[PDB]
Design a protein around this ligand. Structure first.
Ligand SMILES: CC(C)(COP(=O)(O)OP(=O)(O)OC[C@H]1O[C@@H](n2cnc3c(N)ncnc32)[C@H](O)[C@@H]1OP(=O)(O)O)[C@@H](O)C(=O)NCCC(=O)NCCSSCCO
Ligand SMILES: CC(C)(COP(=O)(O)OP(=O)(O)OC[C@H]1O[C@@H](n2cnc3c(N)ncnc32)[C@H](O)[C@@H]1OP(=O)(O)O)[C@@H](O)C(=O)NCCC(=O)NCCSSCCO
Lengths: 308, 308
């Protein structure tokens, strides 16, 4: 036998940990959060996301006590009871694994908490370098990799917010144009909770990084072959959604046949997304507070929690 | 202007943070902790180590609330009020920087806390591979480097203790024989606080490591040229202490002249200790909760605290 920092759960065990947590989300609101391909329904929100929201609100008060201790030690004032220390959450995972929806659902739940906390959600792609700058660094084929984001700027952003700033700015990325939007900004004003979602978020290193500022993090996981399947399938579905727009950077993909589309999508997975997942994303899975394991049908039926 | 995760202090500012913290250490007890070359006196213990001990005891209660939240969420019992969750402390730094004394002094202070906590101290060299095994891996010239320790065993040890085990074993290293002592063990029995001191301790990576289990850590820092100076000087002093013992693995060093000794000590610093410090130890300085900066005279007159 051997001791471990983690505790594994199946949905039956984890759903019981919901207790009385109310369900403040309608089936229609879920739709507004549901991403293309995603199978998440209100049942999963009850048996999986509600226990998560509970665990997170238990730790928010606790986390603040810790920051209180340091404040006390330093002989500082105290804390405007209504302008606390932002609880930062990191959501990571591979492209097409569902992390985007997971973060949006988590934000909706936490925000509808009795004390109605101001909960902001920022995706890291707003921190991607503009295509022209990526071109400069010869990184257009490495878009999504750690070095494709302005990690300095990202770290400055999260640091500014958790340090108690009145406001902090983040650039905005346009998936439609496949590039940063000139002049656009997302202003975050001292939220009570900040969710940061991106491929890169849990990465660690020789310098203090955004992951070192997280008070809680989740990794959305799945069999790599399944994620590729979801990616390719989402790619074919996009021919009639995003790619169908004449303004789309990838509008030429709309006319691909099922066959040509699979070939193109598989190649991008093989040369860009798979390498990034295997080399940079997966290695960060061990440090996540909670790992959500999804089955081939996108169903979350297993979880791994870090008690230590 | 720019926000930061750290707050810098000079001794004048930091010593004021002592408040009423009692001094339960005699000048003679300090001697029993003082390492060869070290200049630490009771004044430094009051202006620097006492504020540290205070800050640590404020965070111990706070840290436990956090583990309490998770226990509550999981619907577990509660916690024998007298067999809690061990607060783990990491102490890192270069060879000859004084980290060994710093850890021993910290242990003495914390243990003499009103509620008399059971405080254990474990140095990582007990986890060094035996010379014969180092020979096997061709690492005898890399002794001290991360790959020279059994990190798997070390992680198992710290994990076992923080997980609440009744007892955990650690091998024992003999500096006199420059090797692991066959059959020797240090038994740690559910301490309230465990201090882990070693060159490697704050290292991070692709797997969950000992640093991920620390609730607080300190890095003992200094100008690299000063540390080399301290190393060489300690080396010459050892000719009449440790090396003077016929049983010493390095007994041949006792007969070196000042000149030959400096040459030998400088070469080891250049080929082993300096490379390790620069490549593996220093890069971990950013993640330490508290950095103790020492001047050429070993004096600690600056500190960097991680509030975030
Ligand atoms: C741009 C980048 C780095 C963005 O990374 P993300 O972490 O946002 O990827 P993720 O899979 O989480 O996508 C997030 C959302 O972004 C959507 N999206 C991604 N690419 C596009 C797109 N080109 N047009 C419209 N929507 C898109 C995707 O459908 C998600 O929507 P939902 O919120 O409704 O679920 C990534 O998509 C990428 O391009 N990686 C490497 C290069 C690559 O894959 N190129 C192929 C481009 S055409 S395939 C578009 C669907 O993947
Ligand atoms: C074995 C190892 C990895 C141990 O690392 P540590 O983190 O314990 O080094 P650190 O500088 O903290 O030494 C801790 C104590 O260990 C003592 N010590 C180190 N080497 C020896 C020794 N050979 N004989 C007796 N005492 C020794 C040192 O004087 C400290 O005593 P205090 O508690 O009184 O301060 C390291 O000393 C080493 O050998 N590194 C690379 C190879 C090397 O430097 N070889 C030269 C050996 S002769 S020089 C002995 C003094 O450095």
């Amino acid at each position: 036998s051997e001791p471990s920092p983690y505790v594994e759960f199946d949905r039956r065990q984890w759903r019981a940990l919901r207790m009385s947590t109310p369900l403040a989300l309608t089936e229609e609101e879920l739709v507004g959060l549901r991403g293309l391909g995603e199978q998440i329904d209100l049942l999963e929100v009850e048996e999986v996301y509600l226990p998560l929201a509970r665990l997170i609100h238990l730790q928010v008060a606790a986390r603040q006590r810790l920051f209180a201790a340091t404040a006390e030690f330093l002989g500082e004032p105290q804390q405007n009871p209504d302008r606390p220390v932002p609880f930062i959450i990191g959501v990571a995972g591979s492209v097409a694994v569902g992390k985007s929806t997971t973060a949006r659902v988590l934000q909706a739940l936490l925000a509808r908490w009795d004390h109605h906390p101001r909960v902001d959600l920022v995706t890291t792609d707003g921190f991607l370098y503009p295509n022209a700058e990526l071109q400069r660094r010869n990184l257009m084929h490495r878009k999504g990799f750690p070095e494709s984001y302005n990690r300095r700027a990202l770290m400055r952003f999260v640091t500014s917010v958790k340090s108690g700033s009145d406001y902090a700015c983040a650039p905005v990325y346009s998936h439609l144009h496949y590039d940063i939007i000139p002049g656009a900004e997302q202003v975050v004003r001292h939220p009570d909770i900040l969710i940061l979602e991106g491929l890169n978020v849990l990465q660690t290193g020789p310098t203090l990084m955004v992951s070192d500022l997280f008070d809680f993090s989740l990794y959305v996981d799945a069999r790599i072959e399944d994620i590729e399947q979801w990616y390719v399938s989402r790619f074919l579905a996009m021919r009639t959604t995003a790619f169908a727009d004449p303004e789309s950077h990838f509008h030429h993909y709309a006319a691909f046949s099922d066959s040509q589309a699979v070939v193109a999508a598989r190649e991008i997975w093989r040369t860009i997304n798979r390498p990034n997942l295997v080399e940079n994303i997966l290695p960060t899975r061990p440090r996540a507070t909670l790992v959500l394991r999804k089955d081939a049908d996108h169903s979350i039926n297993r979880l791994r929690l870090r008690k230590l």
